[PDB]
Design a protein around this ligand. Structure first.
Ligand code: SF4
Ligand code: SF4
Ligand code: SF4
Ligand code: SF4
Lengths: 436, 458
């Protein structure tokens, strides 16, 4: 069982991320998705375009010649398009691959204008002062709410401001969706003595009272992900981004209706993996993702920031670091050779990494480069990780221990609600005991 | 227990199992208790006549200030009472005015053209590309797979029966913004014409004659929370599943469109969900009026998508519900408003809220809605006490599967269930402190809804 596993590998209170003096907050524009030097990539006819447009070309090409991925032939043209139809559908509740613009579209920093809030205004739940201030009872309430909202994993940590972007990528408040990509701007994220989260024309302002972050893990489908870098892997990625959006909205509304404020984020606002590691969901790995006991790295992350008093969870150490030191599988299988085979350092490999923190240093410009080549979001590194396999935790009597030992059949094979697997769904059952 | 085995075993021959007569006409959505003049208004606890959801609101606030989780049922404290109502209100985030019934508005868009997702993906042109698949058998496997991805616990296909489609829908005019929606609801006919795509005009909502099929989805509610009916945690699992309903429809409509066909979302709108669910083989109609399923009983919500995509209809199911309801009267006896009849099925509606012309148990739904502002929720006691909800019902004698009527008949088993139900209403704290899992699903029964190709299409 998983509950015993997490208590068994609990650490003493603190932050597991080692930093030095050179650490500064990271500007979101530096990511490979947004940075000028990485944002444009050639398509297969050599034309230089935004990476996802170049990726769209490869998708249309593959469909036309009956492929499910880079020279992976499909059963027929029918199958090939059905995979991309599912992929595209999955993104229904996500803006521009990630929902990163703060206080725009689904990611509103206040609930006041939402249709839900207006409907319930007579009850006045979002104006009534909180009836609970006890962090223990609130931690239980909000974690129960989080599971209702579709989190497979959830944890709580104090907000480490090092991981919050210095400046967010966003769009001007009067720019309609259709013009968004053309008019992306940078906007500073600052902390001040104010009662509520507020956006000026100059700044995104988070109250100094914003003590806590709630991190959620949203499980991807194992069988679909292991078809990486082909289209079914893109499809499970896509559906979970929409599940991410649902989670943030659901949870923010709960937190507001309890009498607090809440800031959603999805892929924006801050660095997810760092928050997740500090909140005890898992450990950082060679590939760069947060690896969890339940799903390995085959899980998506999202985060909510709030002033609601809560109990920080303890970080976890179940041997990921030492195992990644020996295992080189993701690095060896990476089609673009983006993942380092060397040790951890404090020095960023390029503009895309945040310097001043001990991590494995990877070339994310090389990773992005492969996506127009394969016409997707790859995910081979996730697919091949031993932790992603599902039947790897064994009990030797005393302790719990880690035993350190096709698209058509996916469409024709096992599936269940939201792509969850009933063979392992017991691992994420929760009682109050494991909530606080 | 094998759910696939069971559904296989109780499969019928093709043909709508809802039996009707000559006086059956299509039904005006405004006739429901939620909307109609005669039932729409209810007195709050101070005598004041208000719209029912506003009277309910009043009872909610009263319960919070008094530390109550339900009517005359005390919470642990004021904080717990508020938390239950916060969870309820939050759950509704992706739903418009309790049901998303206005067709072609907000989330229920009949075309995908204006959606941010469709615009982002426009260069791939999946919505403009004609289908690469026309074979109904493969399309059935593809769409049920996506439906499961989209959050359905149950999915079935039926040919569309227009008898169950609302003659006129309750909606708002297009130029009206949400903030005024409640104060500007109109009626608007739904017609079937020879047109290529589903379109709305100033006067009509038009569904193409090519619209051949309806896909029906079952969305499972939480057992523990429903057992607290009529208190707040039962409201919460209801609320949350409505948002799940909404996102199912959007996900699935987009998939169908990107496959080269059109799709019409509905949630609680457009047509009668229970009728489609029965014809699509999700379950059987019951005394209380719900569709009862082998996996969840009536503790499940329904939504539906209408589409021209070629599909293999499912066989209807008969696993004995009718015969069981004919002798069991538990919901009728436990219903706080006496809305549910203890009588036999007729073709005659008891009031304007019923559709005359089809054989069913006739209940008085104005009575039902009447209890909602009293308890300050959406009740659901009928669903909570139905033995089909108890999930310990299936048994294999030796040759075949069957329902264990020990649960419907044995006084000891009934005496227990009444005791556990009595405690459940008063044990909200224990729900908060107790078992939960993703989307409120339960891992002990989650295998019941595993699916392979052989059980999606035949
Ligand atoms: S996503 Fe693909 S290209 Fe990027 S690091 Fe992983 S394996 Fe390499
Ligand atoms: S594949 Fe091996 S080295 Fe890479 S992240 Fe997984 S365990 Fe670590
Ligand atoms: S409680 Fe009894 S009569 Fe009512 S729906 Fe359930 S089985 Fe039928
Ligand atoms: S919801 Fe409550 S009042 Fe309405 S029919 Fe069911 S038991 Fe009776």
């Amino acid at each position: 069982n998983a509950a015993e596993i997490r208590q068994q590998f609990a650490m003493t209170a603190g932050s597991p991320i080692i930093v030095n003096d050179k650490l500064e907050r990271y500007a979101e524009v530096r990511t490979a998705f947004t940075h000028p030097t990485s944002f444009f990539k050639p398509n297969y006819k050599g034309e230089v375009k935004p990476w996802f447009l170049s990726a769209y070309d490869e998708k249309v090409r593959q469909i036309e010649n009956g492929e499910n991925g880079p020279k992976m032939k499909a059963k027929n043209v029918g199958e090939a398009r059905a995979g991309r139809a599912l992929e595209a559908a999955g993104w229904t509740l996500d803006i521009n691959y990630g929902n990163i613009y703060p206080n725009r579209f689904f990611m509103l920093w206040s609930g006041e204008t939402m249709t839900n809030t207006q409907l319930w205004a007579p009850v006045g739940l979002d104006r009534r002062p909180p009836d609970t201030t006890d962090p223990v009872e609130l931690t239980n309430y909000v974690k129960f709410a989080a599971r209702m909202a579709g989190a497979d994993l959830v944890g709580v940590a104090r907000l480490n401001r090092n991981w919050v972007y210095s400046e967010a990528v966003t769009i001007p408040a009067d720019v309609p969706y259709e013009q968004s990509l053309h008019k992306e701007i940078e906007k500073p994220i600052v902390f001040k003595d104010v009662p509520l989260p507020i956006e000026t024309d100059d700044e995104l302002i988070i109250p100094n009272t914003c003590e806590n972050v709630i991190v959620a893990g949203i499980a991807m489908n194992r069988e679909m992900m292991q078809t990486a870098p082909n289209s079914m892997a893109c499809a499970t990625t896509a559906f979970c981004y929409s599940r991410m959006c649902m989670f943030d909205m659901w949870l923010c509304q709960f937190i507001r209706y309890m009498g607090y404020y809440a800031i959603p984020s999805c892929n924006g606002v801050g660095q997810s993996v760092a928050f997740a590691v500090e909140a005890g969901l898992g450990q950082a790995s060679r590939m760069g993702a947060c690896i969890t006991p339940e799903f390995g790295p085959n899980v998506r992350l999202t985060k909510v920031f709030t002033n609601m008093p809560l109990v920080p969870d303890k970080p976890i150490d179940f041997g990921v670091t030492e195992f990644c030191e020996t295992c080189k599988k993701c690095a060896r299988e990476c089609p673009s050779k983006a993942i380092t085979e060397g040790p951890r350092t404090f020095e960023g490999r390029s503009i895309h990494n945040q310097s001043g923190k001990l991590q494995w240093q990877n070339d994310y410009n090389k990773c992005l480069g492969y996506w127009p080549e394969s016409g997707g979001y790859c995910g081979v590194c996730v697919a091949v990780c031993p932790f992603t396999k599902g039947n790897i935790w064994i009990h030797d009597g005393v302790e719990w221990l880690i035993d350190n030992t096709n698209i058509t059949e996916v469409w024709d094979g096992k599936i269940n609600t939201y792509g969850l697997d009933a063979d392992h769904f017991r691992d994420t059952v929760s009682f109050r005991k494991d909530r606080v």
